[PDB]
Amino acid sequence: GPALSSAKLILAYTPPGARGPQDRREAMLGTHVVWDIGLQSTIVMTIPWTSGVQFRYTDPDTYTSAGFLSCWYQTSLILPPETTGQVYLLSFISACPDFKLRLMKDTQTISQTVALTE
């Protein structure tokens, strides 16, 4: 966004096994992170891992105990005068050196079979 713009954004993590918050209130009672907009642009937050049943379930289900991260406006975005539009955020992800990968699988992802040779 612009240099002369400010905003407070609460972003909150809730651990796996907990129902995620419904508003800025319930997120603030969570492990709330502000790291506001107006003087600081790059916000990094580590995501601690917690062992469930000894590892993470890697079969396709839509269970809701995988972790939950979400963000809320703590205040309204203060745009610069005659801005007249939208500003955006950019979100990255990676793994800390604590990462671990244990067994290997077949990796279909498309139910793969092509035997085309030239």
């Binding site: 651990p15 907990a18 129902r19 918050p21 492990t31 062992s51 049943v53």
Partner: protein, 256 residues
């Protein structure tokens, strides 16, 4: 001076029980209830330590051993659900490490004849009243503070109430390789079992997983002298010792 049994103040938090007759102790195995699952992660610790405020002696409701009685069964980490700061830590977090200390006491006069068997059974899977390829849907399993109450309280859809198969398919006199102690009214009136934590996963949800069933069952029937009441009370108290939880600086609110 004379008899000097260990009846002094075991006061612990809000709990000041100190009711011990023949205060001999049988622990489950050679392992004591121990806190630390490991040393460290080579890091500064904010490890959840509720042993300052979880180690109370949470007693239960008293249950009346009549002559026509068969037994009582509580699922131990889920018996203390709707009660204490331990229950609110149980719903409040998810995963926890909980070693227990169970003190079953039976008031009995000198004139009452009978014997009891207390037994602590790890991972006691249940046998259904259907007895087929279906069991209880875990509504009838662990009522909490009320137990399964095997004594002539038969029902439909859930577990069986057969006491010889002890909801397990096993046999009654064969049950003693589990930790146990006999309450003989000639000798003692109470029993203590010291339960360390037991699970193949070091940290686990107690809302989902029933670690221990506790059974108190009359092997020999109670013969009161006639003209007295045909009923004796059983009081069971749980002191969760060296208890640990996982959800540090994480949990906000879940209501249920």
């Amino acid at each position: 001076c004379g008899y000097s049994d260990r009846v002094q103040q075991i006061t612990l938090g809000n709990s000041t029980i100190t009711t011990q007759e023949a205060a001999n102790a049988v622990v489950c195995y050679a392992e004591w209830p121990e806190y630390l699952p490991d040393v460290d992660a080579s890091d500064v610790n904010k490890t959840s330590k509720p042993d300052t405020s979880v180690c109370r002696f949470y007693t239960l409701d008293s249950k009346t051993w009549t002559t026509g009685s068969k037994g009582w069964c509580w699922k131990l980490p889920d018996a203390l659900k709707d009660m204490g700061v331990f229950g609110q830590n149980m719903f409040f977090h998810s995963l926890g490490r909980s070693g227990y200390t169970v003190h079953v006491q039976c008031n009995a006069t000198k004139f009452h004849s009978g014997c009891l068997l207390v037994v602590v059974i790890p991972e006691h899977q249940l046998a259904s009243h259907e007895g087929g390829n279906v069991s209880v849907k875990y509504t009838f399993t662990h009522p909490g503070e009320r137990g399964i109450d095997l004594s002539s309280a038969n029902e439909v859809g859930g577990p069986v109430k057969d006491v010889l198969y002890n909801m397990n398919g096993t046999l009654l006199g064969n049950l003693l390789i589990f930790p146990h102690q006999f309450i003989n009214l000639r000798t003692n009136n109470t029993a203590t079992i010291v339960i360390p934590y037991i699970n193949s996963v070091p940290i686990d949800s107690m809302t989902r997983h029933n670690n221990v069933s506790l059974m108190v069952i009359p092997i020999a029937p109670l013969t009161v002298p006639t003209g007295a009441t045909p009923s004796l009370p059983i009081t069971v108290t749980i002191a969760p010792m060296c208890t640990e939880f996982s959800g540090i600086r994480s949990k906000s609110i879940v209501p249920q």
